[PDB]
């Protein structure tokens, strides 16, 4: 199967550079170009450039002087590098592959890399339980609080629990640190026989925490 | 560069209805337009290439038409999982450019939220802060009011709300409201109440607890 997998989310300091690796499988880099597209609040979807089969590059006009794309065919890796980032470069960056070697209809995409441009320091989250205290249904959750930058991933029971899960968008606190809750509803009778663990991963700080949530 | 203008900005429709997205180009681009679907937290998914051409794995309800400057993506009978943002892309002229997108929202019947309240954990209290969380689960429409009271004092300015995107199956939202107090304030008071107002409730629903 054709896949593109990008390196993890990262904080970049203003005027510093951004580096992202796209590792592909299911096809050879010698046979297809790999494009880079970003998506920001201020600009939406914006094509940045491409590295062609033979190693040639084209860069979109505003990026010709600060964008560098290279690759390692044998390693199936494409390297995106952009210099002098400013806060309006905060965006999700994607690699993508077209349907054919020369074209631009992007049938396959990486999962995206969220880049935050900020002078602040990375900080791992605290995780606190939202303990189950109607209609045989109990709600419980985890409060993932005080981290920077975005994003965090939250799953339940190592991915086995997905039904009834709601992970809320993070909100920025006045501290300049993010906070979010993830909740799930389950039958109250299962509270005594099943375990509920929220698996939290804050990649920018390399922080993984599994919080068990139980009736108080 | 070619400017693509997508309209409307937001489309709200009921399941089973026909829907169409418009993309207008600043100059003629032939049929060199591709369409994408982007679900919440997802990457773009190619729906139609070259204005009207189908893509393998894409449901038959998606189709496209148009040439020149005026293009249309159609969903002939919308399903709940079609909830997403939709984008057009032109590639007649370098550089390839994208529209600003149309958000597709889905209508459904009114559904009252189920309300749950969570006291701060003892774990958190050790750090000197208390978070109290009120959950409004699986409701529609999106509009809701959450009012916090501590010992009958109305709380203002010290809570934040977050709302999920529409669920792909039942089209409902959920909402969290988080009331944040210093530990000292929290310890000074007893009754913590979340009062929820929503169209699907005949009267406000209050969930509360007594600290300890």
């Amino acid at each position: 199967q054709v896949q593109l997998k990008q390196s993890g989310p990262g904080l970049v300091q203003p005027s510093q550079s951004l580096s992202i690796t796209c590792t592909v499988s299911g096809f050879s880099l010698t046979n297809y170009g790999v494009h880079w597209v970003r998506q920001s609040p201020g600009k939406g979807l914006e094509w940045l450039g491409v590295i062609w089969s033979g190693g040639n590059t084209d860069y979109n006009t505003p990026f010709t002087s600060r964008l560098s794309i290279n690759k390692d065919n044998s390693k199936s890796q494409v390297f995106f590098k952009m210099n002098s980032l400013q806060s309006n470069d905060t965006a999700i960056y994607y690699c993508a592959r077209a349907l054919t070697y020369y074209d631009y209809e992007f049938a396959y995409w990486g999962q995206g890399t969220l880049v935050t441009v900020s002078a602040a320091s990375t900080k791992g989250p605290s995780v606190f339980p939202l303990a189950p205290s109607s209609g045989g249904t109990a709600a419980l959750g985890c409060l993932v609080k005080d981290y920077f930058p975005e994003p965090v991933t939250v799953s339940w029971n190592s991915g086995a629990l997905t039904s009834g899960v709601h992970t809320f968008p993070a909100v920025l606190q006045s501290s300049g640190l993010y906070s979010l809750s993830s909740v799930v509803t389950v039958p109250s009778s299962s509270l005594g026989t099943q375990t509920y663990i929220c698996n939290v991963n804050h990649k920018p700080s390399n922080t993984k925490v599994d919080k068990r949530v139980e009736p108080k | 560069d070619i400017l693509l203008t997508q309209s409307p900005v937001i489309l709200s429709v009921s399941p089973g209805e026909r829907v169409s997205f418009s993309c207008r180009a600043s100059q003629s681009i032939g049929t060199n337009i591709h369409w994408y679907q982007q679900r919440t937290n997802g990457s773009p998914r190619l729906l139609i290439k070259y204005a009207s051409e189908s893509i393998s794995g894409i449901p038959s309800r998606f189709s496209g038409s148009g040439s020149g400057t005026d293009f249309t993506l159609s969903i002939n009978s919308v399903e709940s999982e079609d909830i997403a943002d939709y984008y057009c892309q032109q590639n007649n002229n370098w550089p390839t450019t994208f529209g600003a997108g149309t958000k597709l929202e889905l209508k459904r019947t009114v559904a009252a939220p189920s309300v749950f309240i969570f006291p701060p954990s003892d774990e958190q209290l050790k750090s000197g802060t208390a978070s109290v969380v009120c959950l409004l689960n699986n409701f529609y429409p999106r509009e809701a009011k959450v009012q916090w009271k501590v010992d009958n004092a109305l709380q203002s300015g010290n809570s934040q709300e977050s709302v999920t995107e529409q669920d792909s199956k039942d089209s409902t939202y959920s909402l969290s409201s988080t009331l944040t107090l210093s530990k000292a304030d929290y310890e000074k008071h007893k009754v913590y109440a979340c009062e929820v107002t929503h169209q699907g409730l005949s009267s406000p629903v209050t969930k509360s607890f007594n600290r300890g």
């Binding site: 609040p41 939406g44 968008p169 993070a170 | 900005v9 937001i10 919440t40 997108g101 958000k103």
Partner: peptide, 12 residues
């Protein structure tokens, strides 16, 4: 109306 990085969807 613009793309929101926390909700990962358009935010009108």
């Amino acid at each position: 109306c613009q793309y929101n990085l926390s909700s990962r969807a358009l935010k009108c």
